[PDB]
Design a protein around this ligand. Sequence first.
Ligand code: CLA
Ligand code: CLA
Ligand code: CLA
Ligand code: CLA
Ligand code: CLA
Ligand SMILES: CC1=C(/C=C/C(C)=C/C=C/C(C)=C/C=C/C=C(C)/C=C/C=C(C)/C=C/C2=C(C)CCCC2(C)C)C(C)(C)CCC1
Ligand SMILES: CC1=C(/C=C/C(C)=C/C=C/C(C)=C/C=C/C=C(C)/C=C/C=C(C)/C=C/C2=C(C)CCCC2(C)C)C(C)(C)CCC1
Lengths: 731, 31, 80, 69, 69, 62, 166
Amino acid sequence: TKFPKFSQGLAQDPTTRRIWFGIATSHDFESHDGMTENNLYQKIFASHFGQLAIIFLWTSGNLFHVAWQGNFEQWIKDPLHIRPIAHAISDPHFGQPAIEAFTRSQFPGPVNIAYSGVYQWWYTIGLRTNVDLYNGSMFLLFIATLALFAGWLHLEPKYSPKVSWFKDAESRLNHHLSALFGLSSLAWSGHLIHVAIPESRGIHVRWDNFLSQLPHPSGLEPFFKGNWSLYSENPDSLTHVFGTASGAGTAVLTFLGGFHPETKSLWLTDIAHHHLAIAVLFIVAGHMYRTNFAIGHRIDDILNAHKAPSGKLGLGHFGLYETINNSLHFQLGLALASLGVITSLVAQHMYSLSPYAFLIQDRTTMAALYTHHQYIAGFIMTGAFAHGAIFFIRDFDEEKNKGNVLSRILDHKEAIISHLSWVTLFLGFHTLGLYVHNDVMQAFGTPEKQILIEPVFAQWIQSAHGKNIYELNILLSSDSSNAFSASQAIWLPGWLNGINDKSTSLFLQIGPGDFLVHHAIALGLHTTTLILVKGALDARGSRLMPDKKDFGYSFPCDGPGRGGTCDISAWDAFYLAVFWMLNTIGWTTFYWHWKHITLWQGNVGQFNESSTYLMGWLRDYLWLNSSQLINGYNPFGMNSLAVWGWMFLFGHLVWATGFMFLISWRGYWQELIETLVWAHERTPITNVFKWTDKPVALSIVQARLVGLAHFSVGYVFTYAAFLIASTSAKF
Amino acid sequence: MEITTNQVYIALLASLIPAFFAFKLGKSLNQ
Amino acid sequence: SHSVKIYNTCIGCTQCVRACPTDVLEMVPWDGCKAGQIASSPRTEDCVGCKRCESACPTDFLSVRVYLGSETSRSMGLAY
Amino acid sequence: MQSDVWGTVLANKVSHITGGNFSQGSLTINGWLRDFLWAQSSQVIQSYGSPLSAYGLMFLGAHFVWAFS
Amino acid sequence: AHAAIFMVRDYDPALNFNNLLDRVLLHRDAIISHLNWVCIFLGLHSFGLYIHNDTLSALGRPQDMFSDS
Amino acid sequence: AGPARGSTVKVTRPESYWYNQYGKVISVDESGAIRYPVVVRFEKENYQGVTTNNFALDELEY
Amino acid sequence: EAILGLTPCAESAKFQKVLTKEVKALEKREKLYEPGSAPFQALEATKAKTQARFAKYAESGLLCGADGLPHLISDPGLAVKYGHAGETLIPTIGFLYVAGYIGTAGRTYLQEISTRQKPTQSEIIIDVPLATSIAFKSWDWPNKAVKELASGTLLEDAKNVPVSRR
Ligand code: CLA
Ligand code: CLA
Ligand code: CLA
Ligand code: CLA
Ligand code: CLA
Ligand SMILES: CC1=C(/C=C/C(C)=C/C=C/C(C)=C/C=C/C=C(C)/C=C/C=C(C)/C=C/C2=C(C)CCCC2(C)C)C(C)(C)CCC1
Ligand SMILES: CC1=C(/C=C/C(C)=C/C=C/C(C)=C/C=C/C=C(C)/C=C/C=C(C)/C=C/C2=C(C)CCCC2(C)C)C(C)(C)CCC1
C-alpha cells in the first residue's frame, strides 16, 4: 500500500508481513531506501532529542503524581513508619472490597504504594514540600519542550549539521568530559553545599534566599587564601537528627567514611567532596585532545603509536581511528558495553554503600532497585555484543584493517571459542555436580558428608578491607600494617565501624553457599559471553556457510541442505544468548534476595544451612516465600496483595505463551491459516468482508522474536510480583 | 501542602505546549 | 523477488534444474566445463525460495545461490 | 478423589483428606496453584531424611530434565 | 503417526477412487476449519471462565463468579 | 604445471571445506577453456556429503 | 587449629548435635521392631556406621562451621600450613594423574588406528587387544607428554589445520 514509506520492497508486499516488518525496521535508518550519510546523522541527532524529551517528561510525571496524589510531607514527618505512595487508582472495574483494600493513607481513595525510592532521593537532596515537587515538575516540562524544539530546529536545512561536525571526535570528547561530566559534577557539589546540606541541618534555603545565605560561616576567604581545612572543621556529630539542627555541624567538605547513624546513609559532606574532587579530574581530563588551539593530542596519533615491538600484536592499533569514527555500530557497542558495566556497578554499590536517607530500612525498595538495575544491565550487555556483530557484518573491511588487533582477534577466533567452551563445561560439570552431591547427602540423612568449600580467597579480600570475623589480620585488619597506620587515612574509623556492623550490607559475611552461587554466576557470565562471542566472530562466515556476510545480520536460515542450517545467523546467537542472560541475572537476584531476606529477619542460619543444596532453594526460598502472594485473593476474600497475585499468574501465562512461538514453527501455522482463508471465502454473507492484506503466518525470525518477548516479559513480571509481594508481606 | 485544582489546570495547559512540539518533531522526522 | 545467481564453479550436472519445483533454472551451453553446459536462471519471478537447488548442488560451496528478497504473492507461495 | 471420596469415617461423618476444598477452590487458576500445586507439594519437598527421599530427588531431577529439553 | 505413514507410503489413488477415503480427502479444508472453530469456541468458553473467576475474585467481586454460590 | 594423476595436493581455496587439507589428484583436464580442471578426492566428506571437487591450479599447493 | 573463624569438628558442640540428631532418628525407628529381629540389626548397623563416620571426621582435623558441618580449605598455602591438604590438594594430583592417563590412552588408540585402511571401522568396533595394550602401557603418560611437548610432536602446525574464512 503506502506504509512503510521507507521501504518500497515492503510496501509492495501484499500480505500482513508488510505491517509487522514495517514496524520492526522503522528505526534501522541505514537500511532505509535512498539513505545518505548526511541524512542518517541528522535523523539520529533528532531522535536523540526525542529520547531526551521523553525522559524529562517521565521525570516530570513522577514529580507531578507524587506532589498531587502522594504523601510526601507526611512521609517526611515519619520516614520509617509511613509507606510512600506512587499514584492513585481510578479503575472502574474494582469492587467495594478492593476499594477498601487499596485505601491506605489519608488520601480519599485507593492508592499504589511506591517502590522506586524517589521519596528517599528527593528528601535527601533537599526537597521538603509538595510545592517544591510541583515546581520541579514544571521546570522539567519546560526542559522537555526545549529538547523537542531543538530537535525540530536542527532538522531544518539551515541548522542541519554536516557530517564533518558529527565526525569531530576530539572536540566532542573535550566538551563532554570538561562540561557534561565535569561542570555538571561541580554544579551538583554546588547544589549540595548550598541547598542540601543546609536542609539536612535544618536551615531552609531556596531560590529566594540562597544568594544571601552563606553556606559556610567563614565565606570564600578560606578558599582563596588556601586555608581549605576550615571547610572541614566541625562535622555533624553521631547524635545528629537529619533535618534538624540538633547535633548538627558546620563543615561542608569532609572525608569521614561510613554512614550517618540515624539515616544509615553516607554523609552528605562526603558526597559533596566526592563530586568536587571528580569535577576537578574531569575538567582536567577534558583539556587533553586537540581542537582549534594547537595544543593537545590527536587520537589517531596515540592509536598509531601503541604497537608492541615483538610483533605479538601485529601492527597494533593502526587504522582503528577511521574504523571507529566511520562506524556507528562500533560506537554503539562500545557505549553499551561501558554503560552495561556502570549499571551493574550502580546496582552492586547502592545496596552496600547506601547513599539515600532511610532507604536501607525500606526493604522492598532496596530489593526492587537492585533487581531493576541488574536486569537492565543484563539487557544492555547483550546489546553491546549484538551491535558488535552488526559492526563485523556491515562496517568491517579487512583491507583497511589488515594486521591490526581487530583482524588478529578474528584470525584466532577458534582458540577463543574453544577456550570459552572449556571454561563453560568445567564450571557447569563441577558446580552442578557439587550441588547434586549435596542434595543426595541431604536426602540420605547425612549432611556431614556434603562438600562445603570455604571461599577463602573472598574472605581474604574481605579481611584486607577490614573485616575481623575471619581472624586473618592483614592490611586494614592488621593494626601494625602500613595501610592501616597511614596517618592521613581519616576515612578509616568510619569505614571500619561500617564494615564490622551486621546491619549494613557492607561486605556481608560469606561461606559455602556463597561459594557455590558465585560459581554458578561465573558459569552464566561465561556461557552468555560464549554465545555472543561466537555470534560476533562467526558473523561474517563459518565453514557451514562461508558467505554469511552476504545475507546479513538477520535471516532465517540457509535451508535444509548441508545437513540443515536453522538458527545460523548472528541474530540467532543473540536470541539464544538472551535466555542465558535472563537465567544468569535470575541466579544473581535470587541469591541477593534470599541472602537479604534472611539477614533482615535475623535467621542467617537459614541461608547458611539451606543454600548448599537445591531442594533448599526450592523449599526454603521459592515455596516458603510464596505463601502470602498466592493468598492475595482466596475464597474468603482479598487483600492489597491481590494485584501482585494476579500479576504473578499473568507472568506465568505470558511466559508459557512464549513457548508456543518458540516450539511450534511456521509451516504448521501457514497450513492452518490456509484453511481459515478457505472458510472465510466460502462462508456466505460474511465473504463480503474482504481483507486488504492477505493473511499469512508470522515469519521465522519474527516468531523467534515474539517468543523471546513473551518469554522475557513473563520472566520479569513474575519475578517482580514475587519479589515485591514477599518482601512487603514480611517487612 | 495539597496541590490545588488550579495548579492541576495550569499543569495541563502547560503540557499542551510540548504536545505541539512533539507533533512538529514527529512530522519532521517522518520525512 | 528472490535472486538466483550462478557462479563459474558449475560442472553442468543438471541436478539443480531437476530439483526446482517452479521451473526457474535451465541448462544453457557453455565452455567453462567438461559437460559444456552451465545452469542459468531466467525465470526468477517464479522462484519460491525453497533452496532445493542448493541442496542438489555437488560443488564445494555451491555454484547456485539463492538470495531471498522482497516478497510477492508468487514468492510467498499463495493460492489465495 | 482427595477432596470428595478418600478419607476416614467416624460413625457416619466422613473426613476427607483435603476437606472438600475442590468445589470452591478449583474455580480459579490461583486455587489450582495454591490449594493443589503449592499445598499438596509439601510432602515431596519435605521428604529428605526420610524413606520418601527418593521421591524428593526424583522431583528435582525431573524438573531438571524438563528444563534441559 | 501410523495413519500418516499409511497415507504417505501405502495409499494408492487408483484403488481409492470415489470411496470414503477419497471423499474424506476432497473436503479436508472443511474438516480442519470446523475443528478449528470448535477449538476456539471451547477455549474461550472454558478457560475464559477461569480467567473470569480469577479476575473478578481479585477485583473483590466474588458474587460475579461462575460458582455454586 | 599440473599435478600428476595420483599425486597429493593441499587446497588453498578459502571457501572450501577442505582448505588446508590434503587430497589425491584423479584427473587433470588439458583444455584452457576449463576454469577448474583438476579433480581432487578427499577422505573426509563435507557437509553436503560429497568427497570430490574440481580445483584450479592457483588453489593447490603441490 | 581454628582458622577463618571455624572451629575444629573434634571440639564443636554443633557437630555433636548433628550426631545426636541422626542417632535419635534411628532409635525412633528401632522402637517399632523387636530387639532380635533382622530390621533391628539393619538399623544397628546403620547407627554403628554413623557413629564411626563422625568419629573419623573428628580425628582428621576437619573444620566445622556454625552449622556444625565440616568445611574444606582450597587455597594450597592455607591447606599445607594447617594440615588440610587431603581435602582438595591431594585429590587434585590424584584426578590430574587419572585424567592424563585416560587422555593419553585415548589419543594413543586414535593415532594408532588412523594409519589403517578404514580407520572409521576401528572406532565403532574397538580393537580390544590394541586397546588393552594401550591402556596398560599408558601408566607413565608424562613421559609421552613431556616428550611430545619439548620435541614439538604435540601440536599440529597451523598450515595443516582446517579453518574458516577469517
Ligand atoms: C510521562 C509519564 C506519565 C505517566 C506514565 C502518567 C500516567 C498517568 N497519569 Mg499522568 N501526567 C503526567 C505524566 C505521566 N502521567 C504529567 C507530566 C502531568 C502534568 C501535565 C500529568 C497529569 C495527569 C492528570 C490530571 C491525570 C493523570 C493521570 C494519569 C494516570 C492515567 C492515565 C491518564 O489519565 O493521564 C492522561 C495524560 C495526561 C493528563 C497528560 C500526560 C502527559 C504525558 C507527558 C504523556 C506522554 C507520555 C509519553 C511521553 C508518551 C510516549 C509513549 C510512547 C513511546 C508509546 C496514569 C497513571 C490521571 C490520574 O491521575 O488517574 C488516577 C489523571 O487524572 N496525569
Ligand atoms: C542506545 C541503545 C540502542 C540503540 C540506539 C539501538 C539501535 C538499533 N538497534 Mg540495537 N540493541 C540494543 C540497544 C540499542 N539499539 C539493546 C539494549 C539490545 C539488546 C536487547 C539491542 C539488540 C539489537 C538487535 C538484536 C538488533 C538491534 C537493531 C538496532 C537497529 C534497529 C532497531 C529497530 O529496527 O527497532 C524497531 C523495533 C521495535 C519497534 C520492536 C520493539 C520490541 C519491544 C520493545 C518489545 C517489548 C515487549 C512489550 C512491548 C513489553 C510491554 C509490557 C507488557 C505488559 C504489554 C537500531 C540501529 C537491529 C538491527 O537491525 O541491526 C541490524 C537488530 O536486529 N539491536
Ligand atoms: C537446565 C537446563 C539446561 C542445562 C542443564 C543446559 C546445559 C548446557 N547448555 Mg544449554 N540451554 C538451555 C538450557 C540448559 N542448558 C536453554 C533453555 C537454552 C536456550 C535455547 C540453552 C541454549 C544453550 C546454548 C546456545 C549453549 C548452551 C550450552 C550448554 C552447555 C554449557 C556447558 C555447561 O554449562 O556444563 C556442562 C554440562 C552440563 C552441566 C549438563 C550435563 C548433564 C549431566 C551433568 C551429564 C551427566 C549425565 C548422566 C551421566 C546421566 C546420563 C543419561 C542417561 C539416560 C544415559 C551445557 C551443556 C552451551 C555450550 O554447549 O557451550 C559448550 C552453549 O553454547 N545452552
Ligand atoms: C499458555 C500457553 C498457551 C496458550 C494460552 C496457547 C493458546 C492457543 N494455542 Mg498454543 N501452544 C502452546 C501454549 C499455549 N497456547 C505451546 C506450549 C505449544 C506447543 C508448541 C502450543 C502449540 C499449539 C498448537 C499446535 C495449536 C495451539 C493452538 C492454540 C490456540 C487454541 C485455540 C484457543 O483456545 O483460542 C482461544 C484462546 C485462548 C484460550 C487463549 C486465551 C484467551 C483469553 C482467555 C481471552 C483473552 C481476553 C479477551 C480479550 C476476552 C474477551 C471476552 C470477555 C470480554 C468476556 C490458542 C490460541 C491451536 C490452534 O490454534 O487451533 C485453533 C493449535 O492448533 N497451540
Ligand atoms: C581421546 C579422547 C579425548 C581427548 C584426549 C580429548 C581432549 C580434549 N577435549 Mg574432547 N571430546 C572427546 C574426546 C577427547 N577429548 C569426546 C569423546 C567428546 C564427545 C563427548 C569430546 C567433546 C569435547 C567438547 C565439547 C570439548 C572437548 C574439549 C577437549 C579439550 C579440553 C579438555 C576437555 O574439555 O575435556 C572434556 C572432555 C569431554 C567433555 C569428553 C569426555 C572424553 C572421555 C571421558 C575420554 C575419551 C573417551 C574415549 C571413548 C576413550 C576411548 C579410549 C580407548 C579405546 C583406548 C581437550 C583437548 C573442550 C575443548 O575444546 O577445549 C579447548 C571442549 O569443549 N571435547
Ligand atoms: C483546554 C482547557 C483545559 C483542559 C486541557 C486539557 C484537557 C489538556 C489535556 C492535555 C493533554 C492530553 C496533554 C498531553 C500531552 C502529551 C505530551 C506532552 C506528549 C509528548 C509526547 C512525546 C514527546 C512523544 C515523542 C515522540 C514519539 C513517541 C515518537 C517520535 C516523535 C517523538 C520523539 C516526538 C482546562 C480544563 C485545564 C482549563 C480550560 C481550558
Ligand atoms: C564484539 C565486538 C565488540 C564488543 C565488545 C564488547 C561487548 C565488550 C565487552 C567488554 C567488557 C564489558 C569488558 C569489561 C572490562 C572491565 C575491566 C577490564 C575492568 C578492570 C578493572 C580493574 C583492573 C580494576 C582495578 C581495581 C580493582 C579490581 C580493585 C582495587 C582497585 C583497582 C582500581 C586497582 C566491539 C563493540 C568492541 C566492536 C567489535 C566487535
